[PDB]
Amino acid sequence: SMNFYSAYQHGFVRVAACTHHTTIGDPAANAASVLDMARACHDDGAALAVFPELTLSGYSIEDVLLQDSLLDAVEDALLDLVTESADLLPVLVVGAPLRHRHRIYNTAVVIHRGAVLGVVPKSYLPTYREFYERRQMAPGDGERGTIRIGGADVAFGTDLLFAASDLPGFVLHVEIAEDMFVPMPPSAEAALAGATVLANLSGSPITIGRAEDRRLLARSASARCLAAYVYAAAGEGESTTDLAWDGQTMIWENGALLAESERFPKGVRRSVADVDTELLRSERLRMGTFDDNRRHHRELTESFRRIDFALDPPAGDIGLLREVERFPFVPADPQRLQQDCYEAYNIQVSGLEQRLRALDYPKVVIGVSGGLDSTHALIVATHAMDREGRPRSDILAFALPGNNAIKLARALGVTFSEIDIGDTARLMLHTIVTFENVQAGLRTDYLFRIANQRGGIVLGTGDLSELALGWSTYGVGDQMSHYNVNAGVPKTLIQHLIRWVISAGEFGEKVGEVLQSVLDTEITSEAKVGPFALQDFSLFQVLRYGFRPSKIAFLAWHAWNDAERGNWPPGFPKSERPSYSLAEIRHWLQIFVQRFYSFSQFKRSALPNGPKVSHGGALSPRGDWRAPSDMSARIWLDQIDREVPKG
Template sequence: MTFRSAYRHHFLRVAAATIRTTMADPAANADAVLTTARECHDDGVGLVVFPELTLSGYSIEDVLMQDTLLDVVEQHLVALAAATADLLPVLVVGAPLRHRHRIYNGAVVIHRGRILGVAPKSYLPTYREFYERRQVAPGDDQRGTIRIGGDDHPFGPDLLFSATDLPGFVLHAEVCEDFWVPVPPSAEAALAGATVLANVSGSPITVGRADQRRLLCRSASSRCLAAYVYAAAGEGESTTDVAWDGQTMIYENGERLAESDRFPKGAQRAVADVDLDLIAAERRRMGTFDDNRRTHADRVDGFRTIAFTLDPPDRDIGLKRSVERFPFVPADPERLEQDCYEAYSIQVSGLEQRLRAIGQPKVVIGVSGGLDSTHALIVAARAMDREDRPRSDILAFTLPGFATGEHTKNNAIALSEALGVTIETIDITPTARTMLAEMDHPFSRGEAVYDVTFENVQAGLRTDYLFRLANQRNGIVLGTGDLSELALGWSTYGVGDQMSHYNVNGGVPKTLIQHLIRWVISSEQFDDDVSAVLQSVLDTEITPELVPTAEGEEVQSSEAKVGPYALQDFTLHHVLRYGFRPSKIAFLAGHAWSDASAGQWPPGFPDDRRPEYSPAEIRRWLEVFAQRFFSFSQFKRSALPNGPKVSPTGALSPRGDWRAPSDMSARIWLEEIRREVPEE
């Protein structure tokens, strides 16, 4: 398959569809289903879920028991199946079907000319406006076959439909009320291996019911670590005593991917691409999911699997799902506000507890005027406020070296003074010159040699000073390095910025730190003087300030060396949370970053700092990430100081989310990139 095909990267395009129902007219309803199915075929959709009793209409009450209706339903169900012979989508349609002595409310699964099986409604409501047992039988105890059009087909709530050519696509179907009970059939099906759960629903609408359905869909998809595809009946159903809104929606692992407008005029559908790899990854990592399967093995081991070949398209069909440019920074303003509040509070409360536990020492921190030390300083200030301690117990030090700029140093001093912390300056250049001279480094002889030794002499001295100052003044060194730097190994090991007594930033990626500072400004955590300095810090280039530059030269840039933090945080999220292949990450990054004018940006993100990246750039920085993350930097992460986990993506502490050897090669990841990721 072409690299740009969503199906190659194990996405499944699904649709939840509602039609204009014609009551007791199976021919008209089958035609409406076929029209939608053909449109979905053209759109590359692999699964379409329709409402309950699609072919007959849900609201026909006792008419459901008329032989004429049942005969015509069966006739047009067989014809509908035959008409799908050349269509891509698996269809899940509702139909009343005769079996033994009763009628069953079935979800019929159809694909490429065949009826694959029928899942009967297990639980029949007989409360409030519902009286379903009057006409149909519960199917929870059915296991076997059902005869339709002279052929026998699998029948029961225990059916899984598994695609042989799309890894991870395993479908289960249930009917309306089934997902309102405490243990739905879909829950057992998920434990048995279903990844996509379909619900064909009637569900007349009343005030508040739409939110209840959303809650159930979200909960089912979250608990079952699955996709949940829901379609309710809409226009054309009888309004004798109730009304219908045609709500359709798609959820994946608790996140809503798509929802259509309610009360549509005519047919309508919600369409989204479900990430089958993501579902599988979450299940592999959450060991208790399979433990739950073992607990219920007596039931789930009995599920039957019907295999089919989807034959998905080998072309670029786009990607119908939102891909956050900044996985750690949601574009939704309300969600971002909540995330920033929680992240900042986690950092503050983590530091508070550490200070209480060790006798309330002072806090020693090196401040450079950069993002990380700035954020750590305002975390420490808030922790002191909450502990009713003076901010003067924070001992901030600027430690200028050979390349320290006046702008960043002045920001550090101005911020410290505005916060009311104790601020001192110790110029490390004389000590650094002595060390470099004693090492006979070329710089000491007047040569412009700015190698890693030159840089690390400065980084090491800063940390050495901070630890000795902490000894002298009864304090602890507060670390400032962030999650992105830990992932890329962008820190000086040992006596360097990799080490501290406690690091509040170790669980926070660089991209989120920028927004945390923006949130601190917008939420007025501090006064206007503090906010003004914070804004100045945000507007400054990210640089370690270790290499001197002549007038007119660009300052040393961290991102020129390790890659744009926006891209590297994107990759980190998908590696750490899901373990995705580099080729899949490149595919997602292309959709997220190829066009700066498309999609949403987080609130407050400056218009003039919105980059876009070409396939070649994405590939280049993926290689850098793979080399540094898997092969180079683990030894630094294996000796991390304590600090709180902040993001659900994970942390890199060897005591937490990421345990790995320090002497491993990145070869297989680099080979996958070079083999599978195109340069253009």
């Protein structure tokens, strides 16, 4: 029933930061650039278009700001833009010097569908180094009430929110340039009062290092305020009597850069991106201290004035202007991925180290199959022992048949032994896929018994994705161990941790050759539960954000349906770059929500210790995931039936 391909119906809001062509001291010309860009934003289906500080006059005109003809021309141009907006989709946020009471104010005028919703004055006017703003303009901090524009009294002040009544996830707040650089910025109080999209109009003459400063402050605002931050600075056309300009625009969301434009461009530029209002909503739902901070500042935050507007956004397929990683646990960017792998590995190792110290260095018993998970756990166990100054021969590795394993153990210098469970199984199957659980259980039973006998503990090797799907023999089974270093690591990341270890090369070339052989042999269960690439994608969206299934399918389809779009991490030869149809994503998603929400929780409910690894979450019922073991997944399956097309 929803239009599945509509970004607006999935909770996105399309927003634009625009750098126009400045004609200093010519408001009709600045307005014609603005209108042209605003029409491009309309054609793109954008809900918001933010322009540079003092758009209609030029930022850089100093005492010209005070000339009656300049100020009159700004009013005439502004009113003409307002009439134009009757036919434009986006809210426009346009800068203007405007008269109010005794002075002119440096303002952002918020315009929508033929009306002015509000006028927001800059709160802090720098008057130091290259800035002289208090000479021409009055501070807006603490100003409230209304301003008279074109025959209407409209809201004026630095306490205004603009809330889309048909898009509750979109609540706009506006501030100007210096306002975001002070210790207590107006946007931070507005975020706590309910703003989700924070706009900044900037003039910002460019000097060496200044772009880094803008980025630092806008990025950290977006993170600390669990918000999108939409920034536009002035560019070509501002006076270069004493100053230069780079026209930078950028869009941040919760600390992530969604889009940015060319610095020092020839001609106008825009950043345009779909902000996920549900991502912002999900972060604020979970981070309770955000709301405790609002309650601490209740008087400050409860008094904002909320001005309502109806956006009436396009209902159809307008694409999705957003990078959606195929692997939420495996960043495509190589530098970022190296860092993640470094971090995961040390998490795993230091976790195990603390366990070994607290137990006065037991021997470590571990089942090794030659598979990715147990290969990597053995490497972790080895490094933990090395760092604790303990002999590698205190590692007791067991192959348990019902290849690369013995090679790897021999290359590491750990104690390797191979017990054949075939026979004990047989006497079991007699005294009482059955076949295949008896084996799994007898593996575990043995490992524990040897650990008892040898003064050791059992290290587990099962991974987070297996925990998510309940892929595991419950009880006496592979979940059970004294400490599982892989419990927090999703299957999709495991191969990269191994690659990272090989690249490290800190184990020497023989060990690297065996690990490489493991990767080559294992990479090329997924037949029952489907591709781990898709199941790890849904696990992240559910565990981090609680997104509904149709939202997850939509993100997954944009990431995965076309192998040529987007980016792939390192380690994917062209031939190993699969693409998935919506029918496939839908199928594996029905299996995901059933197994995750309903079937699998009981198996997780009694997990072994092991460290949390991913910022996306782990599944410890002592930690990130508290849930009932006895619930149906009916509503999630029904949501898929209702909202995700069959193909």
